[PDB]
Amino acid sequence: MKYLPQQDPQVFAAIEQERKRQHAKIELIASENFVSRAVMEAQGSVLTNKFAEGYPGRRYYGGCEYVDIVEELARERAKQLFGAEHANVQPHSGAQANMAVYFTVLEHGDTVLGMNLSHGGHLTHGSPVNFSGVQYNFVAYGVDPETHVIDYDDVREKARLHRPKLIVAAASAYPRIIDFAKFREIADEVGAYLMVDMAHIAGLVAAGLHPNPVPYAHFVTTTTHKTLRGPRGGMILCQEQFAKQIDKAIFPGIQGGPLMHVIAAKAVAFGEALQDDFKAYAKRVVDNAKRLASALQNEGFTLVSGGTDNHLLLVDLRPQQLTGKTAEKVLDEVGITVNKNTIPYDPESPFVTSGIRIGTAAVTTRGFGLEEMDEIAAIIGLVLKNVGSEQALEEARQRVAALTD
Amino acid sequence: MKYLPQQDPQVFAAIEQERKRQHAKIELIASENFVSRAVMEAQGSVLTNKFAEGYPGRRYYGGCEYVDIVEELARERAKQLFGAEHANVQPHSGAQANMAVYFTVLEHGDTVLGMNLSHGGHLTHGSPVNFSGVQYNFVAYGVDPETHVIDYDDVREKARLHRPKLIVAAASAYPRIIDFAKFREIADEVGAYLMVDMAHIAGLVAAGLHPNPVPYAHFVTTTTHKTLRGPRGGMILCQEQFAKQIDKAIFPGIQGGPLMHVIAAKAVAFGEALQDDFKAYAKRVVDNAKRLASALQNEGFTLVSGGTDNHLLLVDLRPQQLTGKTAEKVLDEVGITVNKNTIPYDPESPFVTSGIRIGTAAVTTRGFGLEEMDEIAAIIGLVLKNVGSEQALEEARQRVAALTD
Ligand SMILES: Cc1ncc(COP(=O)(O)O)c(CN[C@H](C(=O)O)[C@H](C)O)c1O
Ligand SMILES: Cc1ncc(COP(=O)(O)O)c(CN[C@H](C(=O)O)[C@H](C)O)c1O
């Protein structure tokens, strides 16, 4: 940076702290990642100066010849990445991507079926304090109490009982592969649209390591950050038959001007994901996740569903008589970043929880491998099995320091 | 840029075109501006890597110590700038800022009173193809057919007749000062909340050149770009009594994770606006607007309302027997960027229009002054009075080139 340090010392100082923190900590929040310098440069571009309401070649303001090229590069790359017939790369966020799909196919008060929020469903999949739960009538399907795998017969019974206009699949904390084929079969049975929110798994989808929802879902939403390793923002994929309606839902329906500099950064991230080394990266993410799961089981930890098929894992801390909140706090003390997370049929509130959620996408990006996975697991065991030992915590601190260099 | 040119030649080429276009054209779209290099650097920062759901010191994810400082700097600077009791700097856009206020005080189907969309009201103030018009029952107040000034007796009659739960004031194409005191008096008469969308005039408010809605409105929304000359995004100001409810409306109500890098850029822009030279800049914006209005009247053009009190002006092209669409197109041919804009009681559709909207915020930022205003007006007259003369258009082209260097 050149101009920010001179113009705004206060803001620069805090940014510089944050940069150093990102290097110093072991980042295990499942939704987090580190973007390339190219992605950041696109975001820090003069494209923030362009007002571009409308769509490429169909703008409502002149001067958009070049931002049109940028947006089309994003849409075409997204379509190549996911094999979708149409992309909308303007959603400001995953929340707004979801909002737009809901706005497209639902009237106020329509019934929607989504994954139980305490079994892995997202805020925007029907929380009663989110627009989704307030605007529409959400009902929920559950995972099996033993396997912690989605109970497809419960999905089907809930659909047949409640007759939703829309079924939503995908999750913020589900460590197994989702069966989109079964979701579409149920959707077809009850005459419901199927929406897949693939935010967490989108990078893995792109790399052929998770089944692609696109051929099964009427609408696929996602964030561009997370496993896809792009800028913070949303995206909607769909077949050509819904393209016009989805585009009108984004604008003029729920947004105004798009963030053209963020869309440039989306195009950049999509370009990166189309490359072979992103495929290699993504396999290391899943490989690392499986290795981490195994090493945690080796320390004596119980994992929700017994392990992982993706980038993320959930530790059920009940056997250690710990809440997720306690574990989160103590891990924070040693420089490991997790979040407390409800587990299926959690006896604790969402603010306390009986689990922690852990993902490998961030640590994999910085070059951590299987040996680092073993060591992370060993540090977690050291800390959680000795929460009252300041000496154990100091040793943990020093081992975390050795990992991040 | 260093990494983007190497990693993504296609995206870099289009960005580079856009950069050169920004320098080459005369940008007169009223909502546009050019941000500082410090603002862009903040946007291109590693803060895009941080997930920060919740609010400063009340986050739902760890590691937010430093992004908390950044957000607080934005909120405190905003509060100092506008004298507001509470700021929310997380809205992704002006659309989302508006959506959140509506979400806070309205139920589905509530009556809202806003400015007639073809008299200067915004899309999000009740368009029937926008969430606002679909979710709530919007009724409209008008400007006087002669003066083109808001008819405060019509505001009052519409409020008393329709009994709105919320009155909205502010505009995308109103060239006179808005009387917030009268809006609040009417609101108080009918027991309605008052919301002011100050997006266009926020920089002028900050500089003491437009009356401040904050002491009169329950809720003030705005964009951070436009006259405020910051990054693209939204903001809500309000008194402390509504702080908690506004914050919950943004999250968990209508968004998820905030754009911390954009919030850093907001803090930067707010820091700039607190400085004396931003005050001097803003006066030049209004000074230039008045001078431009006068010089256009000198060319024989009719202006909506007879001139301007702010950064923007509307030309009523009916006397020249031109539509706004025709004028927009021909000005585009010579390198002047305007938009077609409906005028009050426009006989044409919103897609054709009888006017063009012109603002000076962008040209003022690049250092244009009164003499440049006279020349811009002279070029506009040359072009619009000779739409069929390729020689007039070439001369216009060369004079535009002389202005932008
Ligand atoms: C499945 C899923 N979809 C959307 C989003 C949020 O998108 P945005 O933040 O851009 O509005 C999420 C967010 N998930 C968070 C995370 O996993 O850490 C958290 C649970 O909100 C999501 O999971
Ligand atoms: C008064 C007013 N409020 C909000 C916005 C849009 O905010 P965002 O684009 O970040 O969602 C606008 C936009 N106005 C545009 C412009 O003036 O050029 C256009 C009329 O939509 C606004 O005017």
Two structure tokens written together for A4: 């920010």
Q: Are A204 and A229 in contact (CB under 8 A)?
A: no
Q: Which amino acid is at B130?
A: N
Same domain, A336 and A202: no
Same domain, B372 and B245: no
How many whole angstroms separate alpha carbon B94 and alpha carbon B197? 9
**Around B44, how many Cα atoms within 13 Å sit in the side-chain half-sphere?**
29
Q: Is B403 helix (H, G, I), strand (E, B) or coil?
A: helix
Same domain, B348 and B263: no
Contact between chains at A253 and B129 (C-beta distance less than 8 A)? yes
- In this structure, the strands spanning A339-341 and A355-359 are antiparallel
Same domain, B181 and B133: yes
How far, in Å, is the centroid of ligand 2 from the Cα of B170?
Answer: 11
Q: Are A179 and A152 in contact (CB under 8 A)?
A: yes
Q: In the β-sheet with B302-303, what is the strand arrangement from edge to edge?
A: B302-303, B312-316, B355-359, B339-341
CA distance A306 to chain B (A): 25
Same domain, B116 and B49: yes
Same domain, B11 and B42: no
Q: What is the largest CA-CA distance in chain A?
A: 65
Domain that holds residue A356: 1-32+284-405
Residues of chain B with Cβ-Cβ distance to A40 below 8 Å are 44-46, 48
Q: Are A12 and A346 in contact (CB under 8 A)?
A: no
Two structure tokens written together for A284: 């290391």
Same domain, A170 and A94: yes
Nearest residue by C-alpha to atom 14 in ligand 1: A172
Same domain, A362 and A399: yes
Residues of chain A with Cβ-Cβ distance to B27 below 8 Å are 63
How far, in Å, is the centroid of ligand 2 from the Cα of B220?
Answer: 14
Among B255, B283, B311, the domain-final residue is B283
The number of helix segments (H) and strand segments (E) in chain A equals: 16, 15
How many whole angstroms separate alpha carbon B185 and alpha carbon B309? 22
How many whole angstroms separate alpha carbon A256 and alpha carbon A258? 6
Same domain, A46 and A23: no
What is the CATH classification number for the domain harbouring A134?
Answer: 3.40.640.10
Nearest residue by C-alpha to atom 4 in ligand 1: A94
DSSP structure class, residue B278 = H
How many whole angstroms separate alpha carbon A167 and alpha carbon A183? 8
How many whole angstroms separate alpha carbon A64 and alpha carbon A176? 43
DSSP string, B136-181: SEEEEE-B-TTT-SB-HHHHHHHHHHH--SEEEE--SS--S---HH
- Counted residue by residue, chain B has a size of 405
Method used experimentally: X-ray
Nearest bound ligand to the CA of residue A118: 1
Among B237, B258, B283, the domain-final residue is B283
What is the CATH classification number for the domain harbouring B356?
Answer: 3.90.1150.10
Cis peptide before B252 (omega within 30 of 0): yes
Instruction: Find the CB nearest B256 among A33, A123, A264.
Output: A123
Q: Is A9 helix (H, G, I), strand (E, B) or coil?
A: helix
Question: Looking at the 3D structure of chain A, how many domains does it have?
Answer: 2
How many whole angstroms separate alpha carbon A149 and alpha carbon A216? 20
Two structure tokens written together for A250: 């984004």
* End-to-end CA gap in chain B: 24
Residue tagged 């627009």 (tokens):
A131
Contact between chains at A14 and B63 (C-beta distance less than 8 A)? no
How many whole angstroms separate alpha carbon B162 and alpha carbon B159? 5
Same domain, B360 and B251: no
Crossing angle of the two packed helices A260-273 and A65-82, in degrees rounded to 10: 40
Two structure tokens written together for B276: 């004396």
- Residue of A7, A33, A106, A260 best to disrupt the B interface, most CBs of B under 10 A: A7
Contact between chains at A268 and B8 (C-beta distance less than 8 A)? yes
Residues of chain B with Cβ-Cβ distance to A124 below 8 Å are 256
Q: How many CB atoms lie within 10 A of CB A402?
A: 10
Residues of chain B with Cβ-Cβ distance to A338 below 8 Å are 62
Same domain, A8 and A148: no
Same domain, B291 and B391: yes
Report the run of H or E that residue B193 belongs to, with start and end.
strand B193-197
CA B280 to chain centre: 20
CA distance B38 to chain A (A): 4
How many whole angstroms separate alpha carbon B58 and alpha carbon B37? 31
Does the CB atom of residue B54 touch ligand 1 within 6 A?
no
The number of helix segments (H) and strand segments (E) in chain B equals: 16, 15
CA distance B131 to chain A (A): 5
Helix, strand, coil: what percent of chain B each, to 5? 50, 15, 35
Please provide residue B232's backbone torsions phi and psi, each rounded to the nearest 5 degrees: -70, 125
Mapping DSSP onto H, E and C, the string for A38-98 reads HHHHHHCCHHHHCCCCEECCEECCCCCHHHHHHHHHHHHHHHHHHCCCEEECCCCCHHHHH
The resolution in angstroms reads 1.9
Provide the b/e sequence for B167-194 (b: ≥16 CB within 10 Å): bbbbbbbbbbbbbbebbbebbeebebbb
Contact between chains at B7 and A73 (C-beta distance less than 8 A)? no
Among B283, B311, B343, the domain-final residue is B283
Q: Considering Cα of B258, then B260, then B266, then B271, what sign does the dihedral take?
A: positive
